[PDB]
Symmetry: C2
Subunit: 64 residues, 2 copies
Amino acid sequence: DKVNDIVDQVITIGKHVKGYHYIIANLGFTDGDLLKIQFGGAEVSGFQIVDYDDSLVSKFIERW
Amino acid sequence: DKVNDIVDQVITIGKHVKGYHYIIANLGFTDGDLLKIQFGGAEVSGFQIVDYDDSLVSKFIERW
């Protein structure tokens, strides 16, 4: 939650363009909305614990 | 309406930063939302037919 608030502020002040580099320090990188700071230009990195490429997880989502 | 759609797209692609100059070709410059491309950096100009500085208009708004 606190991440989306910051990300929103970042876009407002325009500090999401090429030159900036953000690192989301949590296990849910794809858990938040990234479509906003995705085309900004600034590189964004993070961590993902739930690999949606695993057939195990992929099957879970199919029912979820 | 078509202006807000464009303005929104402009902010998304980030073409609202310093260096760009937009001119809203209508008689309602303050009729649309400008708070979005206001802090972007790009200069925005337009036209206003309803002068809210006139005591005549100012009185109208007081009741409106």
